[PDB]
Amino acid sequence: EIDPKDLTFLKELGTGQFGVVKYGKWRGQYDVAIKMIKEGSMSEDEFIEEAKVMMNLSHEKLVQLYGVCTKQRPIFIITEYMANGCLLNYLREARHAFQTQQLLEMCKDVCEAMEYLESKQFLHRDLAARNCLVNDQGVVKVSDFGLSRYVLDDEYTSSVGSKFPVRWSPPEVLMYSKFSSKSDIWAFGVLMWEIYSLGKMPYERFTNSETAEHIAQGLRLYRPHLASAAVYTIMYSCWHEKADERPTFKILLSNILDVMDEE
Numbered sequence: 107e108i109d110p111k112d113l114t115f116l117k118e119l120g121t122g123q124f125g126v127v128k129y130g131k132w133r134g135q136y137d138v139a140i141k142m143i144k145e146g147s148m149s150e151d152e153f154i155e156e157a158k159v160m161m162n163l164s165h166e167k168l169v170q171l172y173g174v175c176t177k178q179r180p181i182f183i184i185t186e187y188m189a190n191g192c193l194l195n196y197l198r199e200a201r202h203a204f205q206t207q208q209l210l211e212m213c214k215d216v217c218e219a220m221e222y223l224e225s226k227q228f229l230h231r232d233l234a235a236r237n238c239l240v241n242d243q244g245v246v247k248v249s250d251f252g253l254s255r256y257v258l259d260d261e262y263t264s265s266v267g268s269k270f271p272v273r274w275s276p277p278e279v280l281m282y283s284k285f286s287s288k289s290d291i292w293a294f295g296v297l298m299w300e301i302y303s304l305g306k307m308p309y310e311r312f313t314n315s316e317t318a319e320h321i322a323q324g325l326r327l328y329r330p331h332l333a334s335a336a337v338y339t340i341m342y343s344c345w346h347e348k349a350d351e352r353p354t355f356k357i358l359l360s361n362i363l364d365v366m367d368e369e
């Protein structure tokens with residue numbers, strides 16, 4: 107529990123599923139992002155209880171939760187600040203003129219965070235480039251893991267809703283609501299495709315409905331030009347029709363390090 111006397115609000119960063127997010131300072135010293143949770147957007151009591159568990163998730167490649175303010179409304183969520191913003195927008199800026207080693211490093215940053223979450227049996231459920239952030243040194247960190255469980259917007263939480271992450275979901279999520287470690291693995295493969303495509307929308311010429319149908323028939327995203335055959339094999343391994351045949355994050359991390367050494 108952070109005392110709100112220790113927070114100063116300095117700039118507005120944007121608006122997300124729970125409303126406004128601000129940049130500010132904690133204890134007059136530390137840069138932070140602060141979500142101001144909009145009334146009616148969140149299942150607040152359930153979140154408040156989970157926040158205690160989320161304070162225990164700490165890894166160099168996960169956005170660090172510093173604390174919450176819950177003795178007031180709106181609730182605040184205070185995290186480490188990520189100065190370069192959303193990974194998706196970062197990938198789409200042509201000025202960065204990324205080398206493919208830098209793209210693989212972004213995939214490794216995410217895989218490390220996810221290997222840690224997997225070790226804690228903690229699902230993200232909305233892993234995608236739009237939910238990763240980039241710091242001032244270009245390191246990518248995974249953001250907002252687990253928060254999907256507290257969203258009160260049926261367009262987001264329903265498989266048939268307009269905001270559901272259809273293009274990052276395996277067939278067993280879309281057809282049966284079967285969520286598992288292996289649905290985050292599928293989404294990770296789509297995120298590597300976003301990275302190597304410099305932020306293209308997955309299945310860029312299809313609708314959400316058409317994507318669900320394409321994948322149910324065994325077809326998959328094509329290799330992005332910048333991906334070698336080895337990089338493509340890693341992302342494609344995440345999309346096996348049988349969930350239990352998809353790798354773990356520990357295996358994907360080993361595969362990525364092997365490609366780094368080879369290429």
Ligand SMILES: CN1CCN(C(=O)c2ccc(Nc3nc(-c4cccc(NC(=O)c5ccc(C(C)(C)C)cc5)c4)cn4ccnc34)cc2)CC1
Nearest residue numbers: 119120121122123127139186187188189190191250253254
């Ligand atoms: C190109 N330049 C670099 C970036 N830039 C920016 O304006 C800019 C710079 C830093 C930014 N940083 C952060 N931005 C945010 C942020 C801002 C707006 C919206 C959101 N999104 C959310 O709060 C949000 C996202 C997903 C979810 C669910 C539950 C659906 C998974 C719930 C909530 C986050 C969070 N952060 C946590 C730590 N750092 C940041 C955001 C924007 C412009 C200049």
